[PDB]
Amino acid sequence: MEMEKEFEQIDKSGSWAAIYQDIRHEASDFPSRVAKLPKNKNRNRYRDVSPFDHSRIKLHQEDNDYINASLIKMEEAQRSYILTQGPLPNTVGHFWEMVWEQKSRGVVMLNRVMEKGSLKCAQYWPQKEEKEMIFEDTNLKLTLISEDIKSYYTVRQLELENLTTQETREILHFHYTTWPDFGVPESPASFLNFLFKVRESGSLSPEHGPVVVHCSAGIGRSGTFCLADTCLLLMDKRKDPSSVDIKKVLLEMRKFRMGLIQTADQLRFSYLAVIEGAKFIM
Numbered sequence: 001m002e003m004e005k006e007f008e009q010i011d012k013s014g015s016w017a018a019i020y021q022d023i024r025h026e027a028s029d030f031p032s033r034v035a036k037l038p039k040n041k042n043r044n045r046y047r048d049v050s051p052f053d054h055s056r057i058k059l060h061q062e063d064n065d066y067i068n069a070s071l072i073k074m075e076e077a078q079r080s081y082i083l084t085q086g087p088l089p090n091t092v093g094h095f096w097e098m099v100w101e102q103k104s105r106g107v108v109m110l111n112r113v114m115e116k117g118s119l120k121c122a123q124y125w126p127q128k129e130e131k132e133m134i135f136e137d138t139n140l141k142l143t144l145i146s147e148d149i150k151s152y153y154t155v156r157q158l159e160l161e162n163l164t165t166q167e168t169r170e171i172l173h174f175h176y177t178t179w180p181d182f183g184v185p186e187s188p189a190s191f192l193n194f195l196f197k198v199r200e201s202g203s204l205s206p207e208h209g210p211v212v213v214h215c216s217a218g219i220g221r222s223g224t225f226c227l228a229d230t231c232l233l234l235m236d237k238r239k240d241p242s243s244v245d246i247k248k249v250l251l252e253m254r255k256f257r258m259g260l261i262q263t264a265d266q267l268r269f270s271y272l273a274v275i276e277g278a279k280f281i282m
């Protein structure tokens with residue numbers, strides 16, 4: 001079925017939970033043996049969210065190459081994404097090592113450091129120009145260059161220096177700051193505006209490594225971001241945009257990381273975002 005009228009048909013019939021459970025039943029199950037090794041316990045935020053072995057990002061290190069991060073490679077859309085958990089106190093150096101080694105231009109953050117009165121990820125970037133951060137375990141230096149605070153999101157320019165080689169690179173930090181502590185946004189308008197700002201920066205384009213996108217677990221809000229982006233790109237590429245099947249795209253993405261889209265409300269919000277976004281594109 002088309003999307004907008006399939007949407008109204010699920011609303012009128014109140015069957016979002018059943019649709020979402022079907023997706024959960026059909027989703028891929030691949031091994032995640034490296035994630036579960038005892039030496040990696042303090043590298044995982046949640047015991048039930050792990051990268052598959054076949055798609056995990058490897059650190060360029062011989063001691064321990066493990067990070068909780070997955071490469072989502074979308075062949076028809078010609079887009080790739082790295083989805084990862086919010087960094088932990090003992091993985092902030094690994095996080096920036098990955099950004100460096102994968103040649104990423106942009107980092108997309110969809111959570112606040114504290115939500116619901118608890119810490120959802122480490123404070124992993126510097127908050128003042130004159131107070132830079134050094135990660136001694138991976139030999140990187142990170143400096144805040146500029147910050148632009150808007151009503152729904154903040155964009156930061158960062159300098160990452162590989163201290164072994166003295167090479168430097170400019171990284172863009174796109175921070176969506178207004179996702180509610182509970183539920184999903186009422187309108188997709190600010191989320192779509194944010195997506196378009198990330199696109200306009202070059203951070204999603206083939207002349208760079210894959211964008212790094214995270215929330216707390218790296219599957220819920222993060223899944224919504226890449227699902228909406230890929231569906232909109234396919235609607236532009238194809239002769240028949242009504243042939244784009246959001247459930248099929250989501251199942252394709254779940255071949256590369258488990259659990260993408262965590263609730264039926266996040267599934268409905270993803271439909272809403274793609275529907276509204278397709279009208280603005282034209």
Ligand SMILES: O=C1OC[C@@H]2N1[C@H]1CC[C@]2(O)CC1
Nearest residue numbers: 074075076077234248249252
């Ligand atoms: O190989 C790809 O690339 C992208 C996904 N896919 C097939 C199935 C679902 C898609 O979204 C479109 C066709």
